[PDB]
Amino acid sequence: SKPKDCIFPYAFKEVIEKKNVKVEVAATERTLLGFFLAKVHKIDPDIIVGHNIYGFELEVLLQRINVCKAPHWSKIGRLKRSNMPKGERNATCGRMICDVEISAKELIRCKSYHLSE
Amino acid sequence: ATPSQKYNSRSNRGEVVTSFGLAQGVSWSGRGGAGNISLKVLGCPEALTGSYKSMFQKLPDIREVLTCKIEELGSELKEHYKIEAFTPLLAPAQEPVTLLGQIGCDSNGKLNNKSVILEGDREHSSGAQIPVDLSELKEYSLFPGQVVIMEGINTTGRKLVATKLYEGVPLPFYQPTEEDADFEQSMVLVACGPYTTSDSITYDPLLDLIAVINHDRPDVCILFGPFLDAKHEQVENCLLTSPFEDIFKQCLRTIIEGTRSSGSHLVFVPSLRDVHHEPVYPQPPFSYSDLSREDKKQVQFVSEPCSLSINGVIFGLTSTDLLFHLGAEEISSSSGTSDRFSRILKHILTQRSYYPLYPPQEDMAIDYESFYVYAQLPVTPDVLIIPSELRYFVKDVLGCVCVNPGRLTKGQVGGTFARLYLRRPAADGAERQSPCIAVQVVRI
Numbered sequence: 001s002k003p004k005d006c007i008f009p010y011a012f013k014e015v016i017e018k019k020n021v022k023v024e025v026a027a028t029e030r031t032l033l034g035f036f037l038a039k040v041h042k043i044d045p046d047i048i049v050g051h052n053i054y055g056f057e058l059e060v061l062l063q064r065i066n067v068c069k070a071p072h073w074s075k076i077g078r079l080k081r082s083n084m085p086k087g088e089r090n091a092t093c094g095r096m097i098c099d100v101e102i103s104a105k106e107l108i109r110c111k112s113y114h115l116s117e
Numbered sequence: 118a119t120p121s122q123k124y125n126s127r128s129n130r131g132e133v134v135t136s137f138g139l140a141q142g143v144s145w146s147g148r149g150g151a152g153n154i155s156l157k158v159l160g161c162p163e164a165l166t167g168s169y170k171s172m173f174q175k176l177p178d179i180r181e182v183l184t185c186k187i188e189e190l191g192s193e194l195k196e197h198y199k200i201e202a203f204t205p206l207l208a209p210a211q212e213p214v215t216l217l218g219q220i221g222c223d224s225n226g227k228l229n230n231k232s233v234i235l236e237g238d239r240e241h242s243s244g245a246q247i248p249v250d251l252s253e254l255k256e257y258s259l260f261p262g263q264v265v266i267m268e269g270i271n272t273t274g275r276k277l278v279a280t281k282l283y284e285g286v287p288l289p290f291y292q293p294t295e296e297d298a299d300f301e302q303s304m305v306l307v308a309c310g311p312y313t314t315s316d317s318i319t320y321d322p323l324l325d326l327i328a329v330i331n332h333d334r335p336d337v338c339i340l341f342g343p344f345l346d347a348k349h350e351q352v353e354n355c356l357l358t359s360p361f362e363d364i365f366k367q368c369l370r371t372i373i374e375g376t377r378s379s380g381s382h383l384v385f386v387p388s389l390r391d392v393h394h395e396p397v398y399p400q401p402p403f404s405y406s407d408l409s410r411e412d413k414k415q416v417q418f419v420s421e422p423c424s425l426s427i428n429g430v431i432f433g434l435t436s437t438d439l440l441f442h443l444g445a446e447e448i449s450s451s452s453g454t455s456d457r458f459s460r461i462l463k464h465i466l467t468q469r470s471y472y473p474l475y476p477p478q479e480d481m482a483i484d485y486e487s488f489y490v491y492a493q494l495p496v497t498p499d500v501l502i503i504p505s506e507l508r509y510f511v512k513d514v515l516g517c518v519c520v521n522p523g524r525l526t527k528g529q530v531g532g533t534f535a536r537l538y539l540r541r542p543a544a545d546g547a548e549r550q551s552p553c554i555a556v557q558v559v560r561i
Binding site: 060 | 211
């Protein structure tokens with residue numbers, strides 16, 4: 001998506017279709033968040049695995065969902081709820097989040113646990 | 118032959134340079150030793166009486182002292198402003214967050230708006246440091262070692278974009294008792310050293326001050342150091358033919374014997390520029406054993422800094438040049454029409470200390486273990502005495518009358534001293550009614 005100001009390069013949709021890449025272009029961040037929520041709800045995974053989720057990405061995603069008033073934020077979890085607390089652990093109830101960085105700290109010694117290292 | 122010529126040949130003798138309160142003439146005459154006089158040192162354990170405790174510190178002790186300072190000030194501000202909870206400095210947060218810390222520069226130079234760093238407390242952020250951005254801040258006034266609470270935006274956890282600066286809250290005023298309001302009017306003279314010109318040892322300004330004290334017969338006289346200047350040319354090169362202790366004793370004896378007929382109480386406050394004393398802040402009271410029984414009721418030795426109630430009126434006495442040390446390392450958003458002295462006085466009164474700047478000036482020895490106990494403000498003083506090399510002034514800041522008469526002798530020419538009239542009005546009214554009625558800064 002284009003955040004607020006920039007615009008997609010011309011014929012981006014056609015080039016996307018030519019190179020058979022499953023990328024759905026969204027005109028707004030709200031559409032992007034709605035698409036992600038719909039994908040999560042339809043797939044319904046048990047475990048979601050990412051990097052720096054519990055110290056960055058999860059709070060950012062929740063904040064941008066709340067700010068843009070994306071429909072059905074509760075699709076990020078498994079229980080239908082109305083009000084979203086500002087309660088980070090309980091936000092994604094029904095699914096277990098696997099932070100690879102945390103397990104790396106708990107298992108492997110290294111100078112730094114960034115993705116590159 | 119040459120020394121002490123310019124001061125003796127002065128022509129501005131007796132000129133009044135500043136007045137505050139109610140208009141008064143030149144006939145400032147008191148009762149001397151008549152009536153009831155209540156001189157008592159108050160506060161924490163009493164202003165330290167012994168010599169000292171140590172000349173050897175431990176770094177964890179200093180760490181504990183600083184952490185306690187930050188924690189108590191932050192708890193007081195949280196209780197005042199009803200803050201829900203503080204946030205760790207290193208934890209990212211998209212929503213605006215409030216942080217508790219102390220201001221500091223990132224290098225060894227002068228603090229400026231591009232070099233501000235906030236250092237968190239041990240309880241919350243485990244002593245973490247983050248740079249602070251002041252581009253979006255409208256009004257601020259910052260100096261190193263200022264315990265502050267900021268409200269800003271920290272989305273990456275590595276830099277704070279400050280948006281609001283909470284104003285500090287001073288200590289409550291001293292609550293008068295029914296006995297304190299029954300006292301009568303009194304006069305206090307205040308003077309600060311050095312008492313001799315930069316090229317002489319005759320101490321002519323000291324004799325002039327003795328003559329003025331005898332003439333005006335005030336109720337109390339406060340004399341600040343140095344009595345033997347460490348920066349004096351004849352002292353720093355060791356030209357004197359007598360020990361420093363002997364010369365100090367001679368000067369003290371001359372002062373005490375001269376004002377014996379006046380019957381006015383004398384309060385000697387030491388300074389870090391005294392050669393014969395220990396150069397560590399806070400300083401113990403002057404040591405003097407050749408004292409007769411009659412003079413033991415008229416001569417008192419207090420520490421530095423001191424919280425001293427005179428007739429139920431609290432005085433904050435400090436000989437260090439706090440105004441010049443703090444005023445040089447301050448940053449503010451306004452410079453066109455603003456009083457620097459009032460701003461730094463507000464900082465001093467809201468920081469709850471006698472030397473709030475950290476780290477202090479490069480030539481300043483501070484024992485922090487004794488600083489944490491013997492150098493705290495118990496309450497907001499009724500009158501604050503802060504003599505400084507800057508221009509003489511008398512300002513009413515936050516209900517406190519702060520008077521700086523300046524040095525009695527500046528360089529080769531003479532200086533000024535101050536006199537204050539004290540009386541406590543009726544208790545009931547609009548709460549704060551200043552006991553200090555009139556202040557007059559007069560040239561010597």
